Amino acid sequence: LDWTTFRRVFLIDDAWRPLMEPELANPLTAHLLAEYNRRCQTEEVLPPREDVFSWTRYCTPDEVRVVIIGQDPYHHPGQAHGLAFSVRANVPPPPSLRNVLAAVKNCYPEARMSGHGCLEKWARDGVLLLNTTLTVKRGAAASHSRIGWDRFVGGVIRRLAARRPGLVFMLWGTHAQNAIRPDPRVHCVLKFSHPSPLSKVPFGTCQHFLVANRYLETRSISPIDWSV
Q1: What does residue 99 show for φ and ψ, rounded to 5 degrees?
Q2: HEC sequence for 55-111
């Protein structure tokens, strides 16, 4: 029971099986898994185990329209919940996320912004919010960056992109842009500087949300309601 067992430990939705099962078999994956489990033995690991793969539960691969790439989970307890950038509902949007939500509003002023930072509505709408590193040691940013999550995540994104052409990729910042390099002739690849206020260009100027909807429409795919 390799897939059966794996899926039980992380509570993964079965619709992702075709995309993830091939990875289970890679010997590099076993090292990754054992290392994640060793860390859990010796430190406070976030997000909680049943949240690590929450993104498999919001929508299926065939429902995915946009892919937004992040780095690693928020390192303070109570913030991260398995999605890149998103925080639990009663957690005030941190700096980078505020800039994202600011950009959406500039792009779509008729947007119903709730003022919250939980992006579950987006996730259910086929916006895949995927971090390249899926866990972090409490308080230490980037502490799990070399254990192997990115090879595994990249593997899943490669299989998703091949399964369906015409995806929109939103690569913000140097790391996201160096980690995932989709065929720009087959998918819509949108690049911008990192959303943090420390970037030279203010993220609120980003118009990726507009351009994305313009691409989807020319493909007869329905556009996203970026309200959240």
Answers
A1: -60, -35
A2: HHHHCCHHHCCEEEEECCCCCCCCCCCCCCCCCCCCCCCCHHHHHHHHHHHHHCCCC
Q: Is the peptide bond before 47 cis (omega within 30 degrees of 0)?
A: yes
Q: Please state, in angstroms and rounded to a whole number, the distance separating the CA atoms of residues 71 and 222.
A: 28
Cβ neighbors of 38 (< 8 A, separation 6 or more) are none
- How was this structure determined? It was done by X-ray
Any idea what the CATH number is for the domain that residue 178 is in? 3.40.470.10
> Among 151, 158, 159, which residue's Cα sits nearest to residue 133?
151
| CA 182 centroid distance within chain | 15
Domains in the chain: how many in total?
Answer: 1
Q: What range defines the domain where residue 200 resides?
A: 1-228
The set of catalytic residues is 72
Given resolution (angstroms): 1.8
